[PDB]
Amino acid sequence: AKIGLFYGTQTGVTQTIAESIQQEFGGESIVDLNDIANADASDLNAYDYLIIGCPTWNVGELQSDWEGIYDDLDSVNFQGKKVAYFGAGDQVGYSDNFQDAMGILEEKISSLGSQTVGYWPIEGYDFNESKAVRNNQFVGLAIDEDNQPDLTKNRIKTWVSQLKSEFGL
Ligand SMILES: Cc1cc2nc3c(=O)[nH]c(=O)nc-3n(C[C@H](O)[C@H](O)[C@H](O)COP(=O)(O)O)c2cc1C
């Protein structure tokens, strides 16, 4: 497929989100679903468009699978690639580290030369701090299944519509 979606998940929430995003784009012919646990950093070179999904764990940390491959990301040339991000988090229980993982990954990947696409508004959330916020916007789609499960479907539909334009679809 033209778009490669790489996700990491601990309790399965991020995977379900990834599956809905794939479905919203039109299926396997449009988006390849890849678990980062089974991937090598170089697998990311094969796509011009990437979607990175990662839930925040422990104290504002990367999901373990993303944690593992983090240092290897330096070996991938991201120049010219357009990358979107999404993450699962808990704004109530971790109000000081909401969606930190997504922020940590975007900081690293954008520093390697990629173009971030898919900024999302912060107004629909209530949190104190997040490493995923830049100039009053999230760097990617923030999902909260713990506190706002009723908003997920529409958030995904809206975000995917937004990305289609930016990914040339
Ligand atoms: C031990 C623990 C630590 C967590 N830490 C954070 C955090 O620092 N920031 C955040 O936004 N969410 C945090 N969360 C919420 C999770 O990211 C959230 O439950 C998410 O749906 C987990 O996704 P997964 O099933 O894909 O791994 C934490 C949850 C648990 C159980």
Given a contact cutoff of 8 angstroms between Cβ atoms, the answer to whether 143 and 98 are in contact is no
Number of structural domains in the chain = 1
The beta-strand segments (E) located in the chain are 3-7, 31-35, 49-53, 82-88, 115-116, 120-121, 133-134, 137-138, 141-143
**Residue 8 belongs to what domain range?**
1-169
Tell which atom from ligand 1 comes closest to the C-alpha of 15.
Answer: 26
Resolution (A): 1.8
Q: Which residues pair with 116 in a beta bridge?
A: 83
What's the 109 CA to ligand 1 centre distance in angstroms?
A: 22
The beta-strand segments (E) located in 8-161 are 31-35, 49-53, 82-88, 115-116, 120-121, 133-134, 137-138, 141-143
Identify the CA nearest to 32 among candidates 11, 59, 13, 53.
53
Identify the CA nearest to 87 among candidates 6, 2, 1.
6
Experimental method: X-ray
What's the 80 CA to ligand 1 centre distance in angstroms?
A: 31
User: Using N-to-C axis directions, what is the helix angle for 13-25 and 152-166, rounded to 10°?
Assistant: 50
Q: Which residues line ligand 1 (CB under 6 A)?
A: 9-14, 55-60, 63, 88-90, 94, 97-100, 145-146
What's the 59 CA to ligand 1 centre distance in angstroms?
A: 9
Tokens found for residue 17: 């989100």
What's the 65 CA to ligand 1 centre distance in angstroms?
A: 14
